[PDB]
Design a protein around this ligand. Structure first.
Ligand SMILES: [Zn+2]
Lengths: 377, 373
């Protein structure tokens, strides 16, 4: 009775309306002029649509907050969603719950969701949005600031619109070692970072069944890599097919290289960078060449003794420096039709050559018909 | 009774703001404001957090319908303070229904989120309004508020909400266009023709017909998937097309363009040349066999609309039997690097995905093709 009045007061203050603007549902009640309706059964309140005339009377109110009156029908649940007027249910996806209204939210570990499908919706204990219908229209829809933060943080850019149309993920096509948390100071060992970056472009196994297998990997999507800092690495890097490597500008024999790759192995009887050539094993399989002195010959290709796995490789301005004493800078083996521009090998460390950061042999190349090196340094 | 109603109301206000019941005061002329955290207006039935620093002894003088409170020590716009604390009221109704806003912390709901009015109050909103049609969005106008608004703003923006280093915003540095922006499938199966065309058109929308010769900004396109298309693509002036690397006798193309027309007596790709009509107007050439002569370019029978075009590493695949791969006609000073035409499909050239004629070029003085394959 007066619990009614104090409740209308509580409801009114929650919605920012007047006490007189809250009406309790009951069959026959005049809905005219009220701003909020209260269901005394479910103990939920809902903003009412504007434009209910005097003398329009309530007929029914479902547990999904569908209101029927003498003049028509309205889904108060959807209206509430449009107004961001939500109820966050007790519990979580992990506890399980049952949802009855469009404006009910269920908490997950990464934020809240509303259910956009058939109501009522039962959620079992130990559930996730993925295991209970997935996300998207007609299913779970992410709601609220906490959810937005985590979606942005873990997303791919699809939430960010760009011009003239589309979204950010549509135009991000370049990889950097910084995506892999490379330190890039020429001091830390960034080897594993660089290898994962390359492997994420094209991950070819070091051992393969037959010839069809090794050739299957030149048929992969090509990706551009941007190197903007200085990466120390300690093991030979094998460039897989379909890689384009890029640096802003070429080094012209500068003293302290601050952008590029610094090869610093324990074993100096090696190459910094090599293309991929697979060599036939006794059993008929093929293993990726790791031998520093090996290079394929036209004969080797024809015999089947070697299969090249170096197609669609492009270098633009790569600076490669090397610890003093390293045998070979770049092994351009099997690189038919592959191209290079502004490839710089060796550092002008200073006057003493025995202490300079440059290889004994700069570049070793075979089986590379139709390859082009521009502005090689 | 009344005093009871006042205590229970203070209780409801206090629960809403998370303060103590004793910390809520009703506005009345002369009330001491010291120590209270929230003020309630009986008339409008609105509550507002009070600024800290109101001294005991400071008394209320007036409180307007815009929530401007005047007291004995000064004045404060409670609506403005509420905005800073993200304490709003979402008005009944919507832009559709129309409304009147009186306070700075009132939000009006629109289909894509909520907005507050940052201009002169009160603000009347006619039924059937939109923020854009009633003052636009920005300082002194409609300001978007809340998570629903932020989501739609981000989703439909250009990146101007996202700061980048060393300064500026994301939109300042986005200089690459892509078929994925137009929702191209890029599987080499779906027909991506209209998508590619819209992409090119958005860069330079040269009509197929031009009134006179006088009638007849450059942008970089990145192609990273495999797009099947079914009608000749006409490359407009001012286009730079790029792919990460070029193919070289590649067996299965998984990156580039695949021309798969019903009518095979056509070109996959063509530059634009306009030919003079008997009435003096010009029409884009669409004849596969046509090429402009130097003389044509001189006597105006043909007008070149192919300057500033660059191609890096484009791979072009063609259904077997297609007449021409690329028509480089009128491409004076235009450049190409690693253009690859034709697929090494298999031993039977009859079924290979390559054209009868790879490249046809005329009127392209000063043109350079590097590592053409
Ligand atoms: Zn409340």
């Amino acid at each position: 009775s007066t619990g009614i009045l104090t409740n209308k007061q509580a409801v009114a203050r929650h919605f920012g309306v007047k006490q007189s603007e809250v009406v309790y549902f009951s069959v026959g009640v005049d809905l005219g002029g009220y701003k909020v309706i209260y269901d005394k059964e479910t103990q939920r309140a809902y903003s009412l649509p504007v434009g209910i005339a005097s003398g329009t009377t309530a007929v029914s109110l479902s547990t999904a907050a569908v209101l029927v009156h003498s003049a028509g029908s309205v889904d108060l649940g959807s209206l509430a969603v449009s107004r961001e007027e939500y109820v966050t249910l007790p519990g979580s996806f992990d506890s399980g719950s049952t949802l009855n209204v469009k404006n009910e939210l269920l908490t997950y570990t990464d934020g809240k969701y509303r259910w956009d499908g058939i109501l009522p919706k039962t959620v079992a204990p130990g559930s996730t949005p993925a295991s209970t219908g997935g996300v998207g229209l007609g299913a779970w829809i992410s709601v609220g600031d906490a959810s937005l933060r985590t979606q942005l943080a873990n997303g791919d850019g699809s939430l960010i619109g760009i011009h003239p149309q589309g979204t950010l993920n549509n135009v991000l096509t370049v990889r950097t070692p910084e995506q892999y948390n490379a330190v890039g100071d020429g001091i830390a060992d960034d080897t594993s970072k660089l290898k994962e970056m390359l492997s994420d472009i094209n991950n070819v196994p070091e051992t393969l069944p037959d010839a069809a297998a090794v050739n299957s990997y030149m048929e992969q999507v090509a990706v551009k890599i941007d190197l903007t800092k200085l990466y120390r690495f300690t093991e030979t890097l094998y460039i897989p097919p379909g890689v384009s490597i890029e640096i802003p500008t070429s080094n012209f024999f500068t003293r302290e290289c601050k952008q590029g790759l610094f090869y610093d192995p324990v074993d100096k009887n090696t190459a910094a960078i090599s293309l991929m050539v697979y060599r036939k094993q006794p059993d008929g399989s093929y293993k990726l060449n790791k031998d520093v002195d090996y290079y394929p010959t036209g004969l080797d290709i024809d015999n089947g003794d070697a299969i090249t796995c170096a197609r669609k490789i492009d270098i633009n301005n790569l600076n490669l420096i090397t610890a003093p004493g390293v045998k070979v800078g770049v092994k351009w083996i099997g690189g038919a039709g592959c191209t290079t521009k502004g490839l710089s090998i060796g550092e002008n460390t200073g006057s003493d050559i025995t202490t300079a950061r440059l290889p004994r042999v700069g570049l070793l190349q075979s089986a590379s018909w139709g390859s082009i090196h521009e502005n090689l340094r | 009774k009344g005093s009871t109603g006042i205590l229970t109301n203070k209780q409801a206000v206090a629960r809403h703001f998370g303060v103590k019941q004793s910390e809520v005061v009703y506005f009345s002329v002369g009330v001491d404001l010291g120590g209270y955290k929230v003020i309630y207006d009986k008339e409008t039935q609105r509550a507002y957090s009070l600024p800290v620093g109101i001294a005991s002894g400071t008394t209320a003088v007036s409180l307007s319908t815009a929530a401007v409170l005047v007291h004995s020590a000064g004045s404060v716009d409670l609506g403005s303070l509420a905005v800073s604390r993200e304490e709003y009221v979402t008005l009944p109704g919507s832009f559709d229904s129309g409304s009147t806003l009186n306070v700075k912390n009132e939000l009006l709901t629109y289909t894509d989120g909520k907005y507050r009015w940052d201009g002169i109050l009160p603000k009347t909103v006619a039924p059937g309004s939109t923020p854009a049609s009633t003052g636009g969005v920005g300082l002194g106008a409609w300001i978007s508020v809340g998570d629903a608004s932020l989501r739609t703003q981000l989703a439909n923006g250009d990146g101007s909400l996202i700061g980048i280093h060393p300064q500026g915003t994301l939109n300042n540095v986005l200089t690459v266009r892509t078929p994925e922006q137009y929702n191209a499938v890029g599987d080499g199966i779906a027909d991506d023709t209209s998508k590619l065309k819209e992409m090119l058109s958005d860069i330079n929308n040269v009509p197929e017909t031009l009134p006179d010769a006088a009638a007849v900004v450059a942008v970089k396109i990145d192609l990273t998937k495999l797009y099947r298309f079914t009608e000749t693509l006409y490359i407009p002036p001012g286009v730079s097309i790029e792919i990460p690397t070029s193919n070289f006798f590649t067996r299965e193309c998984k990156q580039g363009l695949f021309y798969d027309p019903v009518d095979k007596n056509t070109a996959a790709i063509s530059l634009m040349v306009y030919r003079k009509q008997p009435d003096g107007s010009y029409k884009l050439n669409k004849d596969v066999d046509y090429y402009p002569t130097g003389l044509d370019i001189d006597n105006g029978d043909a007008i070149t609309c192919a300057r500033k075009i660059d191609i890096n590493n484009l791979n072009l695949i063609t259904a077997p039997g297609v007449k021409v791969g690329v028509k480089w006609i009128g491409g004076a000073g235009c450049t190409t690097k690693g253009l690859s035409i034709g697929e090494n499909t298999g031993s039977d050239i009859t079924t290979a995905r390559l054209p009868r004629v790879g490249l046809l070029q005329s009127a392209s003085w000063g043109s350079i093709h590097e590592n053409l394959r």
